[PDB]
């Protein structure tokens, strides 16, 4: 019944600090090494350090040059990881992992904790229609979607017809740009023969800014 539950997502301004919790259960907390591993978006795994709660012993990775401080609270079986002087490159998922003596390195992992680092301010997105059309040509089968643009921070959720339309839908991973803002599109292919029968609406939900918008994508 071993389990590792980390704290929720975090959004921090550059130069600031973050402290991620790692609640452990199901084993003798004091006698297993807690390791911390990070993962920048679309990139590999990075060993950050380790702590032995039983004696507070800690080891770190040199690259972080002291910007990392690992602590452990025996009374609550919780391990902490504090990053200092945050920069954009520190934007990543942070995992806590538990060892089991006799070779079982990093056998248990937490669900991960997302930390995004930018100076952008919370903002709801603009929602534009990607209208279906064609007229002549050929290949009879229509594409339509929604341009969800200029929002911060992640994530945004998109559905179609309030969930009724799931087949054919493709919601692309958001891309960050020169502005602090994100942007993405949600597209779906349907029978072009149906543009006159089925009303299509994209349901954009941006929790961080409490923004919800339903945009109808009509032909033209």
């Amino acid at each position: 019944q071993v389990q590792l539950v980390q704290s929720g997502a975090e959004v921090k301004k550059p130069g600031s600090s973050v402290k991620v919790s790692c609640k452990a259960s199901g084993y003798a907390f004091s006698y297993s090494w807690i390791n911390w591993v990070r993962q920048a978006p679309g990139q590999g795994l990075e060993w950050m350090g380790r702590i032995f709660p039983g004696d507070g012993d800690t080891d770190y990775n040199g690259k972080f040059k002291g910007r990392v401080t690992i602590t452990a609270d025996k009374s609550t079986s919780t391990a902490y990881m504090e990053l200092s002087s945050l920069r954009s490159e520190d934007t990543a998922v942070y995992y806590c992992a538990r060892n089991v003596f006799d070779g079982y390195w990093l056998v248990y992992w937490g669900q991960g904790t997302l930390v995004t680092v930018s100076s952008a301010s919370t903002k709801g997105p603009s929602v534009f229609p990607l209208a279906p059309s064609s007229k002549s040509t050929s290949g009879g089968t229509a594409a339509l979607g929604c341009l969800v643009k200029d929002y911060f921070p992640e994530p945004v959720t998109v559905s179609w017809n309030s969930g009724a339309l799931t087949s054919g839908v493709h919601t692309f991973p958001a891309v960050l740009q020169s502005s602090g803002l994100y942007s993405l599109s949600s597209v779906v292919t349907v029978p072009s023969s149906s543009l006159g029968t089925q009303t299509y609406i994209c349901n954009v939900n941006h929790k961080p800014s409490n923004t919800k918008v339903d945009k109808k994508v009509e032909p033209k």
Binding site: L45, G103, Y104, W105, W109, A131, A143, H170, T171, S185
Partner: protein, 219 residues
């Protein structure tokens, strides 16, 4: 720092067939105890990494015996006798023989299927965005395979550069196809200087490049 080097960076596999991933360490990961400290981790899509093989050849409980780990001095290898659709994800190799602990770049395992040409659609800027002073043009490459694809924008037959950004879906679990969007951004004013906006696609499934375009302000 004991460097870990993995190959290939990407590895498509056909369900039922074999599959292998190679890892290489700068130093010898063997110890006096006899135990070699090489570890294989699998990160399934959207999930946290999970220990797959510990100390070179040891199978973690629950790992299908189809998986197996071997190695020789500094050359290590992960084998999947036959591949399941559930073995997809990024495989990382790592060492805990020396501080600081290090990983390999990882190997992204995906399902290899028959080539499929992209269906291409282009989207003019909505009039709503235009009144906002900006024009985004979207070209959609839908349900294709493999992932590799060249998408270039031509404006009045003039090839663009740095003017666009693309984003790609992850392999669909139903048909193993991908989807790519290439967005072009312009000023409302820079957009009304030109007439023909084209999206030209090159792909393994197309005898020759396929171009989809439109003339501004007219449908």
């Amino acid at each position: 720092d004991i460097v870990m080097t993995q190959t290939p960076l990407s590895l498509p596999v056909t369900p039922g067939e074999p599959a292998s991933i190679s890892c290489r360490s700068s130093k010898s990961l063997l110890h006096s105890n006899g135990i070699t400290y090489l570890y294989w981790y699998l990160q399934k899509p959207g999930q946290s990494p999970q220990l797959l093989i510990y100390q070179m050849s040891n199978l973690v409980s629950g790992v299908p015996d189809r998986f197996s780990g071997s190695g020789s001095g500094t050359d290590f290898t992960l084998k999947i006798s036959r591949v399941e659709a559930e073995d997809v994800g990024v495989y990382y190799c790592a060492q805990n023989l020396e501080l600081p602990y290090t990983f390999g770049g990882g190997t992204k395992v995906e399902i290899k299927r028959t080539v499929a040409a992209p269906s291409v659609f282009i989207f003019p800027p909505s009039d709503e965005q235009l009144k906002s002073g900006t024009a985004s043009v979207v070209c959609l490459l839908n349900n294709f395979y493999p992932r590799e694809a060249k998408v270039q924008w031509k404006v009045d037959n003039a090839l663009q550069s740095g003017n666009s950004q693309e984003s790609v879906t992850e392999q669909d679990s139903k048909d193993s196809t991908y989807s790519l969007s290439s967005t072009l951004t312009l000023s409302k004013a820079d957009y009304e200087k030109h007439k023909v906006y084209a999206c030209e696609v090159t792909h393994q499934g197309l005898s020759s490049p396929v171009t989809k375009s439109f003339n501004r302000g007219e449908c």
